Design a protein around this ligand. Sequence first.
Ligand SMILES: [Mg+2]
Ligand SMILES: [Mg+2]
Ligand SMILES: [Mg+2]
Ligand SMILES: [Mg+2]
Ligand SMILES: [Mg+2]
Ligand SMILES: [Mg+2]
Ligand SMILES: [Mg+2]
Ligand SMILES: [Mg+2]
Ligand SMILES: [Mg+2]
Ligand SMILES: [Mg+2]
Ligand SMILES: [Mg+2]
Ligand SMILES: [Mg+2]
Ligand SMILES: [Mg+2]
Ligand SMILES: [Mg+2]
Ligand SMILES: [Mg+2]
Ligand SMILES: [Mg+2]
Ligand SMILES: [Mg+2]
Ligand SMILES: [Mg+2]
Ligand SMILES: [Mg+2]
Ligand SMILES: [Mg+2]
Ligand SMILES: [Mg+2]
Ligand SMILES: [Mg+2]
Ligand SMILES: [Mg+2]
Ligand SMILES: [Mg+2]
Ligand SMILES: [Mg+2]
Ligand SMILES: [Mg+2]
Ligand SMILES: [Mg+2]
Ligand SMILES: [Mg+2]
Ligand SMILES: [Mg+2]
Ligand SMILES: [Mg+2]
Ligand SMILES: [Mg+2]
Ligand SMILES: [Mg+2]
Ligand SMILES: [Mg+2]
Ligand SMILES: [Mg+2]
Ligand SMILES: [Mg+2]
Ligand SMILES: [Mg+2]
Ligand SMILES: [Mg+2]
Ligand SMILES: [Mg+2]
Ligand SMILES: [Mg+2]
Ligand SMILES: [Mg+2]
Ligand SMILES: [Mg+2]
Ligand SMILES: [Mg+2]
Ligand SMILES: [Mg+2]
Ligand SMILES: [Mg+2]
Ligand SMILES: [Mg+2]
Ligand SMILES: [Mg+2]
Ligand SMILES: [Mg+2]
Ligand SMILES: [Mg+2]
Ligand SMILES: [Mg+2]
Ligand SMILES: [Mg+2]
Ligand SMILES: [Mg+2]
Ligand SMILES: [Mg+2]
Ligand SMILES: [Mg+2]
Ligand SMILES: [Mg+2]
Ligand SMILES: [Mg+2]
Ligand SMILES: [Mg+2]
Ligand SMILES: [Mg+2]
Ligand SMILES: [Mg+2]
Ligand SMILES: [Mg+2]
Ligand SMILES: [Mg+2]
Ligand SMILES: [Mg+2]
Ligand SMILES: [Zn+2]
Lengths: 140, 97, 108, 280, 166
Amino acid sequence: LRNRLTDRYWRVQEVLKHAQHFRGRKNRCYRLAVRAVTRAFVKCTKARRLKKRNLRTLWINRITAASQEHGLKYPAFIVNLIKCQVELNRKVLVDLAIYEPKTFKSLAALAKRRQQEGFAAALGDGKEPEGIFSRVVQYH
Amino acid sequence: AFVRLTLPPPKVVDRWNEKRALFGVYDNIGILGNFEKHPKELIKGPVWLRGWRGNELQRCVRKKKFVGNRMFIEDLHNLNKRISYLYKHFNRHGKYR
Amino acid sequence: AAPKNRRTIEVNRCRRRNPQKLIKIKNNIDICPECGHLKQKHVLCGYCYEKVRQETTKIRQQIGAQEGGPFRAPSVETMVLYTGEKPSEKDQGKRIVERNIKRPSWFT
Amino acid sequence: VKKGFRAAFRFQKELERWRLLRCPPPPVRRSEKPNWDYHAEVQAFGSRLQETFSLDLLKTAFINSCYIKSEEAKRQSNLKDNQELFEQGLSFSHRCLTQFLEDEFPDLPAEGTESLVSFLTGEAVVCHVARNLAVEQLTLSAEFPVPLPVLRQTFFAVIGALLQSSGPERAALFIRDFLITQMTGKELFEMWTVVNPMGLLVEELKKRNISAPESRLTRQSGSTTALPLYFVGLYCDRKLIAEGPGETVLVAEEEAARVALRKLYGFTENRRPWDYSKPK
Amino acid sequence: ISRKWEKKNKIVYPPQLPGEPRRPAEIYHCRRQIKYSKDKMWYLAKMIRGMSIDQALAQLEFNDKKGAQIIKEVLLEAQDMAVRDHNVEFRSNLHIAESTSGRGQCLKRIRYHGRGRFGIMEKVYCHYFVKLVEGPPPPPEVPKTAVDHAKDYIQQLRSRTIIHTL
RNA sequence: AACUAAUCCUAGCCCUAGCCCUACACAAAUAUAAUUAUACUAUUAUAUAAAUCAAAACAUUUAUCCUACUAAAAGUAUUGGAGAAAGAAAUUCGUACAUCUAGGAGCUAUAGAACUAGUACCGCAAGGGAAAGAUGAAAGACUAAUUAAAAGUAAGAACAAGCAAAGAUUAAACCUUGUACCUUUUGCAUAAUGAACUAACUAGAAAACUUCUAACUAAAAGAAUUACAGCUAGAAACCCCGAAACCAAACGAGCUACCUAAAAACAAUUUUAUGAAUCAACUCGUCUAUGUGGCAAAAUAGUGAGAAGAUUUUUAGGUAGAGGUGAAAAGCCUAACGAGCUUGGUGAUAGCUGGUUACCCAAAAAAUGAAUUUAAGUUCAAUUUUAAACUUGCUAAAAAAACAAAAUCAAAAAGUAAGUUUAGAUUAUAGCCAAAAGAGGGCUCUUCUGGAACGGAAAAAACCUUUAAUAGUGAAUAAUUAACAACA
RNA sequence: CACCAACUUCCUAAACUUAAAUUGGGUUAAUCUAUAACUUUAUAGAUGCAACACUGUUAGUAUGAGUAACAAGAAUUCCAAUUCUCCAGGCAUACGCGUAUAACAACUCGGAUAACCAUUGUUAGUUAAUCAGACUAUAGGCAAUAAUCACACUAUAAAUCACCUAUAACUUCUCUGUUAACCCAACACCGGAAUGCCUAAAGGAAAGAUCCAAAAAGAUAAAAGGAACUCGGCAAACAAGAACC
RNA sequence: CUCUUAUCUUUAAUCAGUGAAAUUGACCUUUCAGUGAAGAGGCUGAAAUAUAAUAAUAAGACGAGAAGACCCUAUGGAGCUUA
Ligand SMILES: [Mg+2]
Ligand SMILES: [Mg+2]
Ligand SMILES: [Mg+2]
Ligand SMILES: [Mg+2]
Ligand SMILES: [Mg+2]
Ligand SMILES: [Mg+2]
Ligand SMILES: [Mg+2]
Ligand SMILES: [Mg+2]
Ligand SMILES: [Mg+2]
Ligand SMILES: [Mg+2]
Ligand SMILES: [Mg+2]
Ligand SMILES: [Mg+2]
Ligand SMILES: [Mg+2]
Ligand SMILES: [Mg+2]
Ligand SMILES: [Mg+2]
Ligand SMILES: [Mg+2]
Ligand SMILES: [Mg+2]
Ligand SMILES: [Mg+2]
Ligand SMILES: [Mg+2]
Ligand SMILES: [Mg+2]
Ligand SMILES: [Mg+2]
Ligand SMILES: [Mg+2]
Ligand SMILES: [Mg+2]
Ligand SMILES: [Mg+2]
Ligand SMILES: [Mg+2]
Ligand SMILES: [Mg+2]
Ligand SMILES: [Mg+2]
Ligand SMILES: [Mg+2]
Ligand SMILES: [Mg+2]
Ligand SMILES: [Mg+2]
Ligand SMILES: [Mg+2]
Ligand SMILES: [Mg+2]
Ligand SMILES: [Mg+2]
Ligand SMILES: [Mg+2]
Ligand SMILES: [Mg+2]
Ligand SMILES: [Mg+2]
Ligand SMILES: [Mg+2]
Ligand SMILES: [Mg+2]
Ligand SMILES: [Mg+2]
Ligand SMILES: [Mg+2]
Ligand SMILES: [Mg+2]
Ligand SMILES: [Mg+2]
Ligand SMILES: [Mg+2]
Ligand SMILES: [Mg+2]
Ligand SMILES: [Mg+2]
Ligand SMILES: [Mg+2]
Ligand SMILES: [Mg+2]
Ligand SMILES: [Mg+2]
Ligand SMILES: [Mg+2]
Ligand SMILES: [Mg+2]
Ligand SMILES: [Mg+2]
Ligand SMILES: [Mg+2]
Ligand SMILES: [Mg+2]
Ligand SMILES: [Mg+2]
Ligand SMILES: [Mg+2]
Ligand SMILES: [Mg+2]
Ligand SMILES: [Mg+2]
Ligand SMILES: [Mg+2]
Ligand SMILES: [Mg+2]
Ligand SMILES: [Mg+2]
Ligand SMILES: [Mg+2]
Ligand SMILES: [Zn+2]
């Protein structure tokens, strides 16, 4: 036995420290703990991407609740704000509804009015003056 | 795994004992001595591998030539069996032909 | 049929620590007035019973000596007397057993 | 038995870790531990805060009376206390803090502006602030960890030393930065304790010659269940002044009183943020 | 093998100051090698947990298991040393804080079967541990009342926060 | 707050150097059934080693085994189913450490000898053959301590829901997402092998040619060798476990088969005058149930056959594996005989099964053609690949041919970065599904194209959307099982 | 008349582009040696240089599971004691075994549990001229006629040293076996084991305590019917008989 | 057998003592329809659902141990017979 590995104690502890919060023999038996830890790491990596998608669904759900209190569907509210050159994202809109109820109501009226202007422009045909809020500022 | 619960006793090495101090002296006996002696003649070891090197099969066959006739019965039986095993490995087995 | 899997320590703890398998506590333990040793209400005291049986052996040992052999059962009643006591008239013609020691206080 | 001492050396370190967790060591003051020079540490204290101090004054502040007693007892087997600086430093802070509060909240009652000053000069705030500025490390005393009354005293002595060296204007900035900051996010009544809020409200309304409020039930939900919500609004002259939520009518009504008071004294949540912009 | 239970009796605290509650006494005792299974001894050790010395000795005297007699003798020696060596005033003023069983060193033998086969037999042994603490037994458990249950439920509802938002 | 455990250093060993040996151990006993004081009754190795194995079979043949100084001549002359392989001499060279009674980039209790011991134990015998120990200067100081430390348990059973975790969260569980691991299969598994858990042990080895780094250079090398820039030195490489067999020499007939010698048993009843009859003792084992790790590695409970004979039984001796014995069942020869057992040849051989231990970066297959006692394997082409030299490649491609009435061919241009030659090297040589065109009539072949999601079609290897892979509580989009009963 | 939806693409910071035998390259865990360093490090030279997997080898500990299975006749005045209830191969010799023999003391290991020892330790034991074994004077000469109650009687398989002639010696008891609940079968195994006497005068104990479920095994009884059962009268029966191929 | 029944002994069950074996990737171990390799406790869609023991049945876990048999291959063997 000329040369023998003298570090096996610390190589074992690297795996087992990640398994202390498991239940069963998975938290103390190396041949079992090693299989469980790698499955956990794979799940951890795939859940970094899925987290971002989940939060967007939460934002859209809460926005629909806030708009419907004022009689608006989600597609109408979001689309018309864009046509008014408002570039607030969904994450910040949720903050206003929860924490700034009066400001959110003001935005609700603005989106509704722009929708009405579009309806009038559609039904009326020919050359007619454009809506007050339907004027687009230009950049160069 | 289980590890020592105490430190082993210290090892103290004298780097200036006679063997260490004079290592290498007379390695140039030939060039500085008019070539009366070759440096290989300064080597101490088994009779059959002084100033010579080879693979395991070559070492086994060389040992038999030098001291084969002065060996014990059982030692010689094992040496002969080792030769035949090495012969079949080196001449019939391996990745490369 | 053989087990298809090992049973875990968690499942095993639930089988053998169930309240059905534990030792029940006893409510019928009391103290004996005469000796002060413990007993169950529906059972005789062991310490007090032990006294009586020891005396019974002594009497029977004496009865064996008098008879001297098997098949010697008398056809008349028996009675026991202790040192300092003499048969009464009613005791006439009844087997008498003699004990060296004095009459025990509990024995009447 | 394997050859080598390196694995044995490593394991001794882990045995050290295990022993510490099971038997935590008693606390020790940093002065005892290595890498300590008193003179250098004091100078860095001033420069850290971007303030200039006189070395002789600043050192006196840290010395405490209890420390002197211990040294003499050991001596048998000069110095100079910080008592003078403590009294001066505390006095200015009380006046300076009052001046800040009155300008910000003139309407708020006098008793109120005493509770807040008492709140911001108590052991809880002062001890918490003192430790994070290293005051505890530099203190000289006979007991460690330093008791809170001792720790509090040395803190104000330092402000006193700052006052002498650099004058009032500098110290006012010092109190604003480190003491006034501690009231961020704190609701009024969390720092001032008032029982029977309605009684106080009635007196305050009388002073401005306003009629006593009329309690009414603005909104209601789930009254008969075990989780009811109530909104009670105080109406004055048929005009709404405050509205409050609660579990029960009595609790909700009391809540409306606190809402009203806060508006009167101008300590509302949406009040103008404090101003640290001034460099002067 | 480890023998730490024995040494626990030799701890010495510094004298208590006048303004302090009186510290109760503690006694540790065990019997080491016993020809009995530890699984079986567990049921006996479990029963007397929390009881006073007199109540424990009463229940043991009327149990039919072989382990009951061995536990009783260990209990009697613990009581004797408590008064004699650990400055306990009254014998009756004691209760069982801890009682448990442990595995001992065992022996391996052969068990015969019917076709020239065999099996491995174990002759099993166990330990017994106890700790005696001076004072009346601590009061028993009281189940939560209906009012206590509800108060927890409101506390849970009050703890809620708005999740994943500013 | 601790049980079971764990920590340790020296007992010895291994390979060389040196040297022949003169060790042949009170009294008594022992070759007789050894260890029994005296006569019977004589005492004595062996003709040439074989086979496995290599020749991809096998039949001549197959290094060492089966020893005669180192270095060279030389793997040369010669021998050989002239093939696997085998292999000299003439002739040159050499006094060697030389008290080195000494040494170690050898092992430290699963290592090193099997060894504390050829003991305990197993076998009739030849023969096979283990395990383990740990205080201190002093025990004439009560046997020492040290360690959250393995699996296993205890302290302390459990609480709707699910490969047991991950994103999370004020909050352990509730909500959302998610078809265990290795090997093998067609790149596919809810297929099928393997794993109760812990600790230790347990599997790639050589220098002909090539590339890299130096010395000297028409010469290099410390004698024998190579040379039209060479030559010398260094570094760089090719696994483990597992048969049924075959041969040589011992050991076995206390079981069983048959034989030799000396001995023994057989009541009662009817017949007679006996391989007769009824039926015990005794010998055998028809049929059924129980038993099946059994009381038993072939039994128990009943029920059955013979029982003065070719009967049964005891003691001692004989025949031995190319053999013996056999009222022939290819039965029996010490529980496993179509040919005993043990040791050695022996690390037998295995184109077949299983396994083959740290990280990162980069590139990459097809699984077509040809020969083969070849199709469970191998060699050559073709592919891929690393390095080097230097110059045209890929897509496209007019007319004008050759064909018959889209494959060749490749001017000039344009979009674009590969291609040829030289040197070295393996692995691989069975695919699978979808969509076209045929040919033998749902399979079976041949030919062209595409594929191997983490999104979608309900789950979903092969259909559709998709240029690599990173952090973020940003944003715009892609594919996307559904579609809106009469007259006229 | 739109929205939602893949690291596809853009944005802040970065990056510089598509399963697998095989192939080309940069690092590194551990230990030893040279020279250094001094709470465990540096440059070089080395090697028995790294295991979640071979129905791998050795040791340890779980699961199945406190489960399957194992055992001592009754009362008393007490286990070499008395009496009672029931069962029915015992005593010697040969072969083999080798202290298991007896007393005391122990209560660890052994008996598959206790009591008690068959276990551990210490001390003791089996006595022969008759029972059993071993037991050296020499050389010659010579044999027709079984046994079975041996008479009758036949038969067929044809059948257990003595006595004489000569030579030599001319009083003797040492040596060895002797115990037992015992041997061959891995075991305190429902198995195997020769001969003589005898058949209870010798030798023994089927039930640890309690309860009276299912299923399973063994025994006995059964109305009316009597092979209708089943591959088959297998098994059982108040039957145990007859005939034919 | 129609057509089964009753009793006793052994087993069984409860208490006391001693105490094995094959087996075992991990398990927090449900039903129905669909998908699929005649195949799902674990996948898709629905539904059901406080926690643990003791005694029973044998549908499933392609249930466990099978030295259990049929088909094919190898320039693997052995016994027997010959022309
Ligand atoms: Mg998205
Ligand atoms: Mg459960
Ligand atoms: Mg076991
Ligand atoms: Mg061959
Ligand atoms: Mg020559
Ligand atoms: Mg060894
Ligand atoms: Mg060994
Ligand atoms: Mg542990
Ligand atoms: Mg869940
Ligand atoms: Mg198979
Ligand atoms: Mg398996
Ligand atoms: Mg390991
Ligand atoms: Mg014989
Ligand atoms: Mg015989
Ligand atoms: Mg007769
Ligand atoms: Mg026979
Ligand atoms: Mg007959
Ligand atoms: Mg007959
Ligand atoms: Mg006859
Ligand atoms: Mg025949
Ligand atoms: Mg035949
Ligand atoms: Mg045999
Ligand atoms: Mg091999
Ligand atoms: Mg092809
Ligand atoms: Mg051919
Ligand atoms: Mg092949
Ligand atoms: Mg061109
Ligand atoms: Mg991309
Ligand atoms: Mg790959
Ligand atoms: Mg290794
Ligand atoms: Mg293994
Ligand atoms: Mg167990
Ligand atoms: Mg069970
Ligand atoms: Mg049962
Ligand atoms: Mg049972
Ligand atoms: Mg009995
Ligand atoms: Mg005896
Ligand atoms: Mg005795
Ligand atoms: Mg004895
Ligand atoms: Mg005689
Ligand atoms: Mg004789
Ligand atoms: Mg005798
Ligand atoms: Mg047997
Ligand atoms: Mg048995
Ligand atoms: Mg008798
Ligand atoms: Mg019974
Ligand atoms: Mg009957
Ligand atoms: Mg009838
Ligand atoms: Mg019929
Ligand atoms: Mg029928
Ligand atoms: Mg019959
Ligand atoms: Mg029991
Ligand atoms: Mg469940
Ligand atoms: Mg189904
Ligand atoms: Mg499902
Ligand atoms: Mg079933
Ligand atoms: Mg069953
Ligand atoms: Mg199966
Ligand atoms: Mg072939
Ligand atoms: Mg062949
Ligand atoms: Mg052959
Ligand atoms: Zn009494």
